[PDB]
Amino acid sequence: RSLKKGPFIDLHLLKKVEKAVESGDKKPLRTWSRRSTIFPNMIGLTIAVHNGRQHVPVFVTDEMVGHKLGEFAPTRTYR
Amino acid sequence: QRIRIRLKAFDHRLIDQATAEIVETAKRTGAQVRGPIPLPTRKERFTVLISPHVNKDARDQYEIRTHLRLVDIVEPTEKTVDALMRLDLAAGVDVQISL
Amino acid sequence: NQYYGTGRRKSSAARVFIKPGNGKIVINQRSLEQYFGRETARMVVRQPLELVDMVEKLDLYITVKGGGISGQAGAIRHGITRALMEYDESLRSELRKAGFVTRDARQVERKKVGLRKARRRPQFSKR
Amino acid sequence: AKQSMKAREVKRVALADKYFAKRAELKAIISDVNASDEDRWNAVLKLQTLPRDSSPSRQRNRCRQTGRPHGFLRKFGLSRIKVREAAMRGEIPGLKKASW
Amino acid sequence: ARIAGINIPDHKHAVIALTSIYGVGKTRSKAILAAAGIAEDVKISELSEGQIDTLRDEVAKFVVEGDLRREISMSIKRLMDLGCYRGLRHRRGLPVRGQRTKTNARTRKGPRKP
Amino acid sequence: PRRRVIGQRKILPDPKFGSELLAKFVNILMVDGKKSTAESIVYSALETLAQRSGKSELEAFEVALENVRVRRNALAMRWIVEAARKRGDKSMALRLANELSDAAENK
RNA sequence: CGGUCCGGCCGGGAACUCAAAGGAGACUGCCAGUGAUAAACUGGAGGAAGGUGGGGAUGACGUCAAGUCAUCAUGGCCCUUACGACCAGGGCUACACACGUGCUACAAUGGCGCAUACAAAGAGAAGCGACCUCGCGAGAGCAAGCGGACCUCAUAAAGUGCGUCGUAGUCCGGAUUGGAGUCUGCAACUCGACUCCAUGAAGUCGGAAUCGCUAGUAAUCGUGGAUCAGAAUGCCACGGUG
Ligand SMILES: [Mg+2]
Ligand SMILES: [Mg+2]
Ligand SMILES: [Mg+2]
Ligand SMILES: [Mg+2]
Ligand SMILES: [Mg+2]
Ligand SMILES: [Mg+2]
Ligand SMILES: [Mg+2]
């Protein structure tokens, strides 16, 4: 979908990656960036992805690299 | 050299009034002009709704006619240039000069 | 001596240049068989030169712009009839009888408001 | 529309010529240059810190007299309703009902 | 004539008969016949066994069999076992890439029943 | 039609044969305004009827026309073309040639 | 007509096509028959056009509690640290169904491949963007011309010529899905367009019912524009065949 010259990631979430790797793993990180591309330096962390009203924690897995964080947060409740 | 005057206006009966005043002045002062040529009129067409609500079928049909006139002057005689450059023309006529 | 006649159609425009003596047809620097892909379009220009006999008797030098297959062919057919009336001036009674000198002025009907086409209305419900 | 909605549109245009007129124009070229900085131009990350409302895609062309966002015309800068009212009273030169 | 693609092609022209293999369309069949040197309008008659096994060598570069069925399937298994949003669309028989689900979703949903 | 009683339009005849009746026959088979492909089928069908199914091409069509009989000629030509499309042969020129062969021998 | 590097391209030519300012021309004007000698109708000539030539604008009094408190007129009161305002994300695009409106189909009047001919009308400066080069391609890079009868979008498509498939769920039809990409834009997960590869649903002409249309119409073929950063099977226009 996106062009190959640079996978997109927000600046506020990229700063949250830097402190989490150095200072060790923490509580699940609340964010709103549903459009960021998962990089390999995030594997192991838990990021709470906002889905419209709440935050769902997503345990990052090795095969999640390349996809979006919005692909792990259902936006509507179905019954 | 050669100077040309591109004339454009919204009215067809008004664009030839300002055109004839230039050509008659040019022939009187001794200039060589190959007449005025009728260029094709670029007419726009506007079709918009008349109602702000339902009954889509009733509409309005507008147009804007922009006629074009070109006068080619062969010789840059100083008597020709000084008269034509500050003529009193109609307000609805836009002039374009190529020196 | 040149003999000229203007014939046109919907969006075509054809000139006709007559010169005395050949069976030559040159359309847009091409031949009659080369330019016309349709066999019907080859024969509709032969229709005005049917009552008046041409075999190898007069040149025709024609060009045409705009239109299509039969739009150009109808433009040539009108242009030849005005050239023969220029050529002889007594042939008119045969040309009025054929019906070829009448300019077909059936232009396209405009696309109307509220309809997808000139007369075709979008589909209608009873109730 | 509402007066608060048109105040948003003036706020977007005032930031558009401010930020994204010349600065984002440079940052788009640096990402586009094939000759130099094929890997580490980093102009995209600097574009992220800029405010969003300078974007030309976010602004909405609306009627200058009423504020209607629907039926805009770039010829007059007005909505389709106000084109009729100026034409019937002779406020727009040359605009009249057509027939063809 | 039996290829590594064990299913037997019909006795017709070459570019049509290679289409019967799962994973070889019309364009890829043009690429095999151009790389081999066989004309596209040649039937299975006079297509000798020295010309069949050189088509086996060209098709050997691509995985086109039930082995291709599992790799399309396990790629979807990567989505469904991960728990992603796109993995949920395949499990419930729903369209994935943005098609509407009000009406006209009859391919994904299956035949209608009130 | 209630008050407006007018005639019917008189189209130009067949350019190849000079036949007024054959010009209305090609317009029935013509779909989407494709005159060039419609007359190509009809000319190819009648040459099958002429060369291998009986000479006098203009008279051979009339014998097939006579058995299935302005409107009487119009309903006759329409029944030939519509029945030719629902056949088992390969092309439209071959199907309409067999229909004129059957209509000449009234079957 | 001279000039050939075969291009109106360059001297030129002002003829013609085209371009648009004005005017002529169709007015039952003329003839014959019918009709109460009337209006009118019928027939014919002339004429490019003949009986309101073709099309548009042009829509009475009234019917629809139709549309506009958002063109305004007549507003009066409520909310007012909120019924207001700012921002992030989501939703307007959901999904067991129903209804109306469209597109592409179910094919040899066709599919595909090669060669190739003919449009009209528009749009273009924070724009249209050629040439050259690269990629199967969507495009990318380089870079003229052009506020435009100059330049660009832009090679119109059906058609034509040959070859092929041979009546079948097919070289029909393209849905859906996977993988790999392009472009727009802070940003294409929810929810963009397009291209490449692969997959090849239903469908073999459609019940009761129901719609459009009396001629350049129907049918069909493509093109352009408005909206628009981008996003048309909708809508507005334009022609081709007929
Ligand atoms: Mg926008
Ligand atoms: Mg295959
Ligand atoms: Mg009511
Ligand atoms: Mg009321
Ligand atoms: Mg207000
Ligand atoms: Mg197909
Ligand atoms: Mg009627």
Side-chain angles (χ1 to χ4, degrees):
Chain A
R1 295 181 181 92
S2 179
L3 51 89
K4 297 295 288 184
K5 272 78 70 178
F8 182 73
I9 188 166
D10 286 330
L11 195 277
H12 65 271
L13 187 63
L14 184 63
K15 289 175 93 288
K16 292 174 73 68
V17 175
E18 293 292 327
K19 279 89 172 65
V21 175
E22 183 178 2
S23 177
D25 52 354
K26 259 64 187 300
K27 77 277 194 185
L29 281 73
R30 293 178 64 190
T31 189
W32 291 267
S33 180
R34 301 181 72 250
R35 60 186 178 179
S36 66
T37 302
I38 297 169
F39 285 97
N41 56 5
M42 296 175 71
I43 298 169
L45 296 173
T46 60
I47 289 94
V49 178
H50 190 269
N51 56 2
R53 63 182 180 178
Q54 292 180 356
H55 293 88
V56 173
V58 175
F59 180 74
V60 181
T61 318
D62 197 1
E63 67 269 13
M64 291 182 180
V65 175
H67 296 89
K68 300 292 181 68
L69 291 176
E71 294 178 354
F72 296 100
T75 63
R76 75 273 193 190
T77 300
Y78 177 71
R79 290 290 184 268
Chain B
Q1 296 294 321
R2 181 178 291 172
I3 54 171
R4 65 186 68 187
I5 298 170
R6 293 178 65 88
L7 293 173
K8 61 178 72 175
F10 288 161
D11 195 0
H12 67 280
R13 67 181 181 179
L14 189 144
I15 189 167
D16 55 356
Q17 293 178 357
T19 303
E21 290 179 353
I22 298 169
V23 179
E24 182 68 27
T25 305
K27 293 189 265 75
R28 185 176 64 247
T29 188
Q32 293 179 357
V33 174
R34 280 88 166 93
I37 54 170
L39 293 175
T41 298
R42 296 294 297 161
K43 55 177 73 175
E44 295 181 355
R45 294 181 186 273
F46 286 159
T47 301
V48 296
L49 294 174
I50 192 170
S51 177
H53 209 186
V54 79
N55 291 320
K56 189 71 179 292
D57 289 332
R59 292 190 182 184
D60 286 330
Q61 293 177 356
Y62 292 102
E63 70 180 0
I64 296 170
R65 292 181 181 177
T66 303
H67 300 285
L68 293 173
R69 294 292 184 269
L70 178 59
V71 174
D72 291 331
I73 299 168
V74 174
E75 295 293 327
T77 304
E78 188 179 2
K79 292 184 262 75
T80 303
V81 173
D82 291 331
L84 295 175
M85 193 269 284
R86 286 189 179 94
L87 291 176
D88 186 74
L89 294 174
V93 176
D94 184 73
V95 296
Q96 293 179 356
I97 186 65
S98 296
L99 192 146
Chain C
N1 194 0
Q2 296 298 109
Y3 295 97
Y4 174 71
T6 300
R8 63 173 64 89
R9 201 68 188 272
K10 299 176 184 178
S11 64
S12 296
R15 64 178 63 250
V16 170
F17 288 153
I18 300 297
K19 189 178 289 293
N22 270 317
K24 182 174 72 69
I25 293 94
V26 176
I27 173 165
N28 292 318
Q29 292 88 21
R30 294 178 63 87
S31 177
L32 181 63
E33 296 291 326
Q34 294 178 358
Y35 185 77
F36 285 167
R38 183 176 292 173
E39 188 178 2
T40 302
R42 294 183 180 94
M43 292 178 182
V44 293
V45 300
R46 294 178 182 177
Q47 291 179 356
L49 296 170
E50 183 177 0
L51 278 75
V52 179
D53 193 1
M54 185 189 77
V55 175
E56 292 289 327
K57 294 180 181 179
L58 59 93
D59 277 324
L60 62 93
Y61 182 75
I62 56 173
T63 59
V64 66
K65 293 180 177 67
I69 302 300
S70 66
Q72 290 176 354
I76 298 164
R77 192 265 305 277
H78 191 198
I80 294 169
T81 58
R82 290 188 180 181
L84 269 66
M85 293 185 287
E86 183 68 28
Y87 181 74
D88 188 76
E89 188 69 26
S90 67
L91 294 174
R92 291 189 177 182
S93 179
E94 294 178 353
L95 270 66
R96 293 295 300 164
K97 187 257 183 66
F100 289 160
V101 297
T102 299
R103 192 262 187 274
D104 194 2
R106 292 193 297 271
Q107 298 294 322
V108 293
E109 187 175 2
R110 52 89 47 80
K111 189 259 192 295
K112 292 182 175 66
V113 62
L115 281 74
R116 196 181 73 186
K117 290 181 181 179
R119 291 184 182 272
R120 186 257 189 274
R121 183 74 183 272
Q123 292 300 110
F124 179 73
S125 179
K126 183 71 175 178
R127 65 182 181 179
Chain D
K2 295 184 289 294
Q3 296 298 110
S4 66
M5 295 300 291
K6 292 188 287 184
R8 293 179 182 176
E9 294 293 327
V10 179
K11 186 256 184 65
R12 290 183 180 93
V13 173
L15 293 176
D17 54 355
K18 187 181 264 78
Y19 291 102
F20 288 178
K22 61 178 73 173
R23 284 190 287 273
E25 187 177 2
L26 291 173
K27 291 182 180 180
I29 293 169
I30 298 299
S31 297
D32 192 73
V33 169
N34 200 1
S36 297
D37 289 331
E38 293 180 352
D39 187 74
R40 202 177 293 173
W41 62 90
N42 289 321
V44 178
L45 294 174
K46 299 295 186 291
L47 187 64
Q48 296 176 358
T49 61
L50 296 174
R52 293 182 182 178
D53 289 331
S54 297
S55 178
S57 297
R58 293 178 65 91
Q59 68 181 358
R60 182 65 178 171
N61 289 318
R62 293 179 180 176
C63 182
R64 298 294 299 274
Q65 293 180 357
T66 60
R68 180 70 179 272
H70 297 285
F72 184 77
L73 292 175
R74 288 180 176 90
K75 182 71 176 178
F76 302 102
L78 297 175
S79 178
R80 61 175 173 85
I81 301 167
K82 303 299 289 184
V83 175
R84 182 259 181 92
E85 297 177 356
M88 295 297 172
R89 289 189 294 271
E91 294 179 354
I92 295 171
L95 190 63
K96 66 183 288 183
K97 291 178 71 67
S99 66
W100 66 91
Chain E
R2 279 86 65 195
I3 317 169
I6 313 167
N7 193 0
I8 298 168
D10 195 1
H11 291 87
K12 286 182 180 179
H13 291 170
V15 70
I16 291 97
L18 290 173
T19 311
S20 296
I21 301 169
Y22 184 83
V24 175
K26 188 178 289 293
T27 302
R28 184 175 290 173
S29 179
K30 290 176 70 68
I32 299 299
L33 293 174
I38 307 299
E40 296 178 354
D41 56 355
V42 176
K43 290 183 180 180
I44 307 299
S45 66
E46 194 67 28
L47 185 65
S48 178
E49 294 293 327
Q51 294 178 356
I52 297 169
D53 55 356
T54 187
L55 295 175
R56 295 184 180 95
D57 293 331
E58 292 291 327
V59 78
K61 293 181 183 179
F62 288 160
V63 180
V64 280
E65 203 58 20
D67 295 332
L68 186 61
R69 271 81 178 272
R70 67 185 68 186
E71 290 292 327
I72 299 168
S73 179
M74 288 296 172
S75 66
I76 304 169
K77 294 290 180 69
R78 289 179 185 271
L79 295 174
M80 292 186 286
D81 292 331
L82 189 64
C84 65
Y85 176 73
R86 295 179 67 248
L88 294 172
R89 306 294 294 166
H90 293 285
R91 185 178 294 113
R92 296 180 65 88
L94 296 174
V96 179
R97 60 174 65 92
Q99 287 83 17
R100 66 183 295 165
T101 60
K102 181 71 70 67
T103 56
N104 295 322
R106 190 60 60 198
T107 302
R108 300 293 295 164
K109 292 181 181 180
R112 67 178 66 249
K113 185 176 179 179
Chain F
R2 175 176 285 165
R3 179 67 67 87
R4 187 181 177 182
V5 177
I6 61 169
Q8 295 180 358
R9 65 185 66 250
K10 299 294 182 181
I11 61 171
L12 293 175
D14 194 2
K16 185 176 179 180
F17 291 100
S19 178
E20 185 179 1
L21 193 277
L22 292 175
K24 296 180 178 67
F25 182 75
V26 297
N27 287 318
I28 298 169
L29 189 146
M30 180 180 71
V31 67
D32 297 334
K34 291 182 180 180
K35 180 63 68 68
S36 179
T37 63
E39 67 182 2
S40 297
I41 294 170
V42 176
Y43 288 164
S44 179
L46 292 173
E47 287 291 326
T48 305
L49 185 63
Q51 201 275 122
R52 284 181 179 90
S53 296
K55 296 300 291 182
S56 297
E57 180 181 0
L58 293 175
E59 293 180 354
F61 182 75
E62 187 177 2
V63 177
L65 186 66
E66 185 179 2
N67 290 319
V68 295
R69 290 178 181 176
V70 177
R71 185 174 175 86
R72 183 178 292 172
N73 291 318
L75 293 175
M77 293 184 287
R78 184 176 292 169
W79 288 350
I80 296 169
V81 178
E82 291 179 353
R85 180 75 273 176
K86 301 284 102 175
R87 293 182 63 87
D89 292 331
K90 305 296 182 184
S91 67
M92 194 67 202
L94 294 173
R95 287 180 177 179
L96 191 143
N98 291 318
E99 287 290 329
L100 295 175
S101 297
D102 292 331
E105 294 179 354
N106 63 15
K107 64 181 180 180

